[PDB]
Amino acid sequence: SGLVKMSHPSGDVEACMVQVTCGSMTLNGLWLDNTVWCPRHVMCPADQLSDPNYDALLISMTNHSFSVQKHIGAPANLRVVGHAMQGTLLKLTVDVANPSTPAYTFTTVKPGAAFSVLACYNGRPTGTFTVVMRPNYTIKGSFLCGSCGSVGYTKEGSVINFCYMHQMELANGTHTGSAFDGTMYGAFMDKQVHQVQLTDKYCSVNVVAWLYAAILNGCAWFVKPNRTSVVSFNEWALANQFTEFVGTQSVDMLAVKTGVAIEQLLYAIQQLYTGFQGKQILGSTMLEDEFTPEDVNMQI
Amino acid sequence: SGLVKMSHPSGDVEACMVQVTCGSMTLNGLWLDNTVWCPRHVMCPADQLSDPNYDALLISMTNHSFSVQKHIGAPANLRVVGHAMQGTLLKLTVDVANPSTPAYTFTTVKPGAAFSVLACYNGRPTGTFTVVMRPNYTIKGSFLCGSCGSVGYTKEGSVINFCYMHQMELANGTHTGSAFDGTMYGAFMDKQVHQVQLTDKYCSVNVVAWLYAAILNGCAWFVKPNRTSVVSFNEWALANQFTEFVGTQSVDMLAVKTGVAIEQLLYAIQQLYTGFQGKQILGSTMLEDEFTPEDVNMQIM
């Protein structure tokens, strides 16, 4: 028992990190087979960090303009042999195939899904943490300058699902990247400028999962016969900043084991939104939406 | 910025996890050079949890009483050729050396310092998460049955500092283990007898760090002119389940960049124990002490 946030073991992903460097601009690269993905703002100097014609920067660039170096080991130097643009990413093709390429896939996440991040600086992994993809389409992480390109992923069996490559910071402590198809999550642009983000809804399903976890592992008190039909709750959610609760088998499993119905909870969450009191429940003091239903079962 | 919880990369340590088995008892061991470390309760059957004298159990063991499999690329089977017991750990010696043995040390961590745990199950890594060693010498982590043998570590530069091996759950949803000198964390004994506590205290130096990070993210209001000497505080700390703020760590540095005096926070913490206003500080209305000064530095240096 006990409920902490966990990232996946990073060994397999760590072996794919490299440092892409375009002149004086330098960031992080993902190396799989003999392709190196990295963010496209690496080819942007400083003066034009504003309104850059990327298609012009793309044709401007030539293979000799780039460099990439594996610091992990054994290194080291790979020859950039071909380049293309794929949305906000830049798809570098390289001399050698990564002998440590895992069984991998490229998938996008939805709000409320979780993935683990490998935070790298100059192609050197430094830390990992798990994050949830937000409703406004941002993540709350901790990344510093030169962290761009650092990746997010999940593991389905032996296959490592790659879902994120960090791009930039917006707001304070709030971040975005793109998916490996090139699409920035939530439209944002790969250039820092006025692009203020939509408001943050609370992940209602994840809260519900979190509250089931708390019913296990201890208490479990606010649970009363008072309930709120998922349909009346989802109407309330529109006004009060919660997501539209859907629910799943994974959630039913949590209901059945505890013996507490979904609704008895959906009610409760309405009362702790106001009553930020308890005093606490697990964590926390009130409302964690970072813990998915997938997670909560996985930790029993 | 943000301030999330970061375990170190697990790579190096994942390479060193194996499965150990004795009787039909099976747990996670750590393989370094020609040496495999695992909790000593593996060789207990189940009927001896009350008075397992391991002194007895270690003699009755032959090398050929233990199977040890790696499981992770590249597999797998390794052959024991030298057993031993050192405190609550088991020290095995095996026919082959780990070719992916990192640079490492054993170092006993102190309360309030943090480290990354690699959760294992049948010699298989499964999750990592950072955690803090509490005052009461427990860690409030997440394990299940089987994970025993799981290991906690702190990467110092190019070196791994092994500081934990997971041994049991104090039937609480909090956990303790051994260090890699044999010694248990807290003076506990590895047994099914019901065991005591040693209440928690808030890690003062860690709350202070957190409050700085709040200021670094623009959260201040709890700040005032007031102060309260370090020693003043430490006297009060005793009475209210807080640790002696030795702090006095080369940070500071957080005191230097914020221009907010360490003592000022000692006053604010004092009132925030009373309070809150209630405003919130980085999404909380209770003092958070699982973040070290170093975390706050690394995370915004």
Residue numbers in the entry:
A (entry chain B): 1 to 300
B (entry chain A): 1 to 301
Question: How is this structure described in the published paper?
Answer:
The crystal packing belonged to space group C2221, with unit-cell parameters a = 87.2, b = 94.0, c = 155.1 Å and α = β = γ = 90°. The final atomic model containing two Mpro molecules in a crystallographic asymmetric unit agrees well with the crystallographic data and the expected values of geometric parameters. Interestingly, the dimerization interface situation with the MERS-CoV Mpro was found to be different to that of SARS-CoV Mpro where there are four amino acid pairs with intermolecular polar interactions (Ser1…Glu166, Arg4…Glu290, Ser123…Arg298 and Ser139…Gln299). There are only two pairs of intermolecular hydrogen bonds, Ser1…Glu169 and Ser142…Gln299 that are associated with the dimer surface of MERS-CoV Mpro according to the current structure. Based on the current structure, residue Val4 showed a hydrophobic contact with another protomer’s residue Gly141. Our results confirmed that there are fewer intermolecular polar interactions at the dimerization interface of MERS-CoV Mpro and this results in the enzyme being in the monomer form in aqueous buffer; this contrasts with SARS-CoV Mpro, which is mostly in the dimer form in similar circumstances due to the greater number of intermolecular interactions.
Similar to other CoVs, after entering the host cells, the nonstructural polyproteins (pp1a and pp1ab) of MERS-CoV are synthesized and then cleaved by two coronaviral proteases, a main protease (Mpro) (EC 3.4.22.69) and a papain-like protease (EC 3.4.22.46). The MERS-CoV Mpro, namely nsp5 of the pp1a proteins (residue 3248–3553), has been identified. Like other Mpro, there is a catalytic dyad that consists of a His residue and a Cys residue. Sequence alignment suggests that MERS-CoV Mpro, in a similar manner to other known Mpro, has a chymotrypsin-like architecture consisting of a catalytic core (domain I and II) and a helical domain III; sequence identities of CoV Mpro protein range from 50% to 80%.
